[PDB]
Amino acid sequence: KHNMKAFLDELKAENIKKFLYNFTQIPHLAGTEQNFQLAKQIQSQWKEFGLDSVELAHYDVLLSYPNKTHPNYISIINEDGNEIFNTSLFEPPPPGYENVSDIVPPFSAFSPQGMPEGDLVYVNYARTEDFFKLERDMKINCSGKIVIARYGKVFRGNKVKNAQLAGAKGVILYSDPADYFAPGVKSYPDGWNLPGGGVQRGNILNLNGAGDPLTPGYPANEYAYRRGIAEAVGLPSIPVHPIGYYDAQKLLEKMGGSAPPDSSWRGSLKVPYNVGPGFTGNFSTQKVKMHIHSTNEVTRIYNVIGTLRGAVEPDRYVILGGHRDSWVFGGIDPQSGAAVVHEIVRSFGTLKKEGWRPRRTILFASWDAEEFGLLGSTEWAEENSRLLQERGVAYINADSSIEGNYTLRVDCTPLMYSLVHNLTKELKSPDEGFEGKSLYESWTKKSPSPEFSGMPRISKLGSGNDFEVFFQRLGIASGRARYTKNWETNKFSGYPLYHSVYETYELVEKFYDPMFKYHLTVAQVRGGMVFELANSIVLPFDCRDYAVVLRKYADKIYSISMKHPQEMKTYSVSFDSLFSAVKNFTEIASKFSERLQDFSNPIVLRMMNDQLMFLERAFIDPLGLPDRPFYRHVIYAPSSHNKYAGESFPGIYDALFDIESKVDPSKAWGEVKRQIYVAAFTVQAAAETLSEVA
């Protein structure tokens, strides 16, 4: 038989191991020849594996690279302008790779050039609330200062945006052992911890969904008109550079001024964590000087797009997509995901050779330039937005398969909650002490839902990965699944070796997943989701699960507003319309489910499948969110304070944010109420797409 079990059994941990090894021997930096070579290899193998067609889609996008002959670094500069301390020019390469060429040294992609010098202020994680604490409570002024912030908690671009708006003239990012060194485990190469010479790369753009900075709205094709650099989307206006904790120790040890406001501001280094500004009296004339010479350049990138035509509904598209470009070797990020995708393709191609075709078309993507702002996925979706809008059933992402070995981590639309619960009950757990138990049982046990008993946690979709354009801009049902670690508050932080040269094949084979059984579990979850979305006669979405979270989000937003009862009186701020819309959505969803259960008629079915397919679509507002035209989903958006985090009713949330500080409370509360109207309307409108059609 050709059913899901046949698909699933054909997947092998050994194949995923081999692919991972193969994809991680050299660096595959976006825009470089070696990543073009690997694109061509993936394209050739997906053809060999059986796909009906496999093409490269290329674009010319703004990327960013250090100057090879003019290295970036930071100095402590004495009063005569002698540079008495220099941060490192590279990370000490790992054993056996100390002769790899073309390892990009640590840098912040899209930093402007500059050599600012001044006094340090230490800003903790550089969160919105950390700047509130500094400026509001401690009355510390970041204007003309160089901020040094620790990585963790939030997306690094938000930190740089927050620093810039506090008036900083430069940002230094470092990894603190508090966030990137787990107690009792050894530094790479002898464990999975970050060495003091290890550095996290990453871009620091604030694109808000735009894709290529130069071509918002439209694919960066051969005839594209490009914005001038000065009108580019999302570029930081101050120099930024990242460092390891040996270098950071050196920069923080001398710091004076005010003490840390409390213990949540202290990392694990044997330094005071003085906020500053500047150094203690003896070194008070010493300054910090950045040297940043990176350049932004329009560079060609390549997505691999494979197509497996559907037997019955070829004009319906289930997309499995993940990136191929890496900072250096990509041993976790992304090749542990890409190797899983390669084996999924192999498996579907095995059944295809035996004469099987999925019911719907499956599209497989190897995205380029994810690391530089989701550029490959976005430009491709901009080019194909009409097809995706009218034909896109679902998008399953496939970045890093593992970031730990503790339990499953799922972020998806409520429309896939049931699909995921059901599939995980059919899969074996690979965890120790759950042999013979389902993945559902181990996941639910290790990662319990905060609201429901005997349910696992599933999180909301924000941004920080290639699903973003499909879900947030286009409104296509999206999901992702990976293995993760226990470490609670380290959620948006990363694993220790994230974006460092130390992220290697050996890292994975030795310390994460020696048997490739977590990878295999992840391939079963991703591939199984895709198989069901692509082959189930009725789309496997439960609209009633959306009704349930909509009420939870309404309760939550209402409780946030209700911290301001006097203003809700004065300005007549009612949530009645939103709760009404949610009630209607619940009732109408329930009736649709009855009909879906209660109908040999392919038109009713497809009509009903179209209703299911367009329900996620219905949450899109074509006017987008305020000042964020590419974030169009009214229920979810990437948090304005942390793009990695999903926020619910983002328009009302931001209208309420820090409202007690607004100068015109009438205008601010009027906007809260505008946003309530927009959300109530959109919920009601999405509900009506599920009513009888005529």
Ligand X SMILES: N[C@@H](COS(=O)(=O)O)C(=O)O
Ligand Y SMILES: *[C@@H]1O[C@H](CO)[C@@H](O)[C@H](O)[C@H]1NC(C)=O
Ligand Z SMILES: *[C@@H]1O[C@H](CO)[C@@H](O[C@@H]2O[C@H](CO)[C@@H](O)[C@H](O)[C@H]2NC(C)=O)[C@H](O)[C@H]1NC(C)=O
Ligand U SMILES: *[C@@H]1O[C@H](CO)[C@@H](O[C@@H]2O[C@H](CO)[C@@H](O[C@@H]3O[C@H](CO)[C@@H](O)[C@H](O[C@H]4O[C@H](CO)[C@@H](O)[C@H](O)[C@@H]4O)[C@@H]3O)[C@H](O)[C@H]2NC(C)=O)[C@H](O)[C@H]1NC(C)=O
Q: Which residues bind its own copies (CB under 8 A)?
A: 52, 217-219, 221, 223-225, 307, 309-310, 312-315, 317, 361, 383-387, 390-391, 576-577, 602-603, 606-607, 610-611, 614, 617-618, 621-623, 629, 670, 673-674, 676-678, 680-681, 685-686, 688-689, 693-694
**Of 128, 647, 200, residue with least CA distance to 411:** 647
Which range touches ligand U (CB under 6 A), out of 25-33, 492-500, 575-583, 633-641?
Answer: 575-583
How many angstroms separate the CA atoms of 305 and 69, rounded?
Answer: 36
Alpha-carbon distance of 347 to 17, in angstroms, equals 15
218 is in an annotated binding site: yes
Q: At its nearest, how many Å lie between ligand U and the CB of residue 684?
A: 4
Q: Estimate to the nearest angstrom the gap between the alpha carbon of 76 and the chain centroid.
A: 34
Give least dist CB 347 to its own copies, A.
Answer: 19
Asked if residue 582 lies in contact with residue 683, where contact means CB atoms within 8 angstroms, the answer is: yes
Binding mask 330-349 for Zn ion (x = CB under 5 A): ---xx---------------
Quick one: 151 or 443, whose CB is closer to ligand Z?
A: 443
3-state secondary structure of 482: strand
Q: Output the CA torsion 115→119→122→126 (10° steps).
A: -50
Q: Which stretch binds ligand X (CB under 6 A): 40-48, 314-322, 460-468, 616-624?
A: 460-468
Q: Which residues are catalytic?
A: 370, 574, 610, 633
- Residues of span 366-385 touching Ca ion by CB under 5 A: 379, 382
Q: Taking CB under 5 A as the rule, does residue 303 contact Ca ion?
A: no
What does the H/E/C string look like for 591-614?
HHHHHHHCCCCHHHHHHHHHHHHH
| Residue 463 interacting partner from Zn ion, ligand Y, ligand X, none (CB closer than 5 to 8 Å by kind) | ligand X
Q: Does 659 bind ligand U (CB under 6 A)?
A: no
Torsion of the alpha carbons at 200, 205, 209 and 214, rounded to the nearest 10: -130
Which of 336, 540, 287 lies closest to 418 in space, CA to CA? Answer: 540
Q: Is 481 labeled as ligand-binding? A: yes
465 is in an annotated binding site: yes
Query: What 3-state DSSP class applies to 148?
Result: strand
Q: Which of 34, 44, 284, 295 binds ligand Y (CB under 6 A)?
A: 295
Contacts of residue 148, defined as CB under 8 A and 6 or more positions apart, other chains included, come to: 120, 121, 122, 123, 171, 172, 173, 174, 248, 251, 252, 288
15 vs 675, beta carbon nearer its own copies = 675
> Considering only 40-48, 213-221, 356-364, 398-406, which stretch makes contact with Zn ion by CB under 5 A?
398-406
Q: Which does 212 bind (CB under 5 to 8 A by kind): Ca ion, ligand Z, its own copies, none?
A: Ca ion
Q: Give the contacts of 141 (CB within 8 A, at least 6 positions apart).
A: 135, 167, 277
183: phi then psi, degrees, rounded to nearest 5:
-45, 130
Q: From the CB of 371, what's the least distance to ligand X, in Å?
A: 5
286 vs 278: CA distance, rounded Å: 8
Whole-number Å distance between alpha carbons of 178 and 489? 11
Piece of 81-89, 110-118, 227-235, 351-359 that binds ligand Z (CB under 6 A): 81-89
Q: Which of 7, 23, 180, 192 binds ligand Y (CB under 6 A)?
A: 192
- 407 known ligand binder: no
Residue 373 or 624 having the CB closest to ligand X: 373
- Smallest gap from Cβ 112 to ligand X, in A, equals 17
82-88: long-range contacts at Cβ-Cβ below 8 A with a sequence spacing of 24 or more?
A: 83/289, 84/286, 85/250, 85/251, 87/241, 87/243, 87/247, 87/250, 87/251, 88/197, 88/199, 88/243, 88/244, 88/246, 88/247
Phi, psi of 205 (to 5 degrees): -75, 155
Torsion, CA 46, CA 49, CA 52, CA 56, rounded to 10: 10
Nearest to residue 106, comparing CAs of 93, 95, 122, 125? Answer: 93
- 224-232, 390-398, 403-411, 576-584 -> range binding Cl ion (CB under 5 A): 390-398
211 binds, among ligand U, Ca ion, Cl ion, none (CB under 5 to 8 A by kind): Ca ion
511 binds, among Cl ion, ligand Y, ligand U, none (CB under 5 to 8 A by kind): ligand Y
For the window 613-652, what string marks contact with ligand X as x by the rule CB under 6 A? Answer: ------------------------------x---------
Question: Do residues 511 and 192 touch, judged by C-beta distance below 8 A?
Answer: yes
- Residue whose structure tokens are 């801009």: 473
519 CB-near residues (< 8 Å, 6+ apart): 13, 16, 17, 20, 336, 339, 340, 401, 402, 513
C-beta atoms surrounding 538 within 10 Å: 13
Flag whether 551 is marked binding: no
Query: What mask of x and - would describe binding to ligand Y in positions 391 to 420, judged by CB under 6 A?
Result: -------------xx---------------
> Could you say whether residue 659 binds ligand X (CB under 6 A)?
no
Of the residues 119, 212, 333, 542, which one makes contact with Ca ion according to CB under 5 A: 212
Footprint of ligand U on this chain (CB under 6 A)?
222, 577, 580-581, 584, 680, 684
Footprint of ligand X on this chain (CB under 6 A)?
202-203, 370-371, 373-374, 463-465, 643
Q: Which parts are annotated binding residues?
A: 156, 203, 215, 218, 323, 333, 370-371, 379, 382, 399, 463-465, 480-482, 498-499, 643-644
Q: Which parts are annotated binding residues for Ca(2+)?
A: 215, 218, 379, 382
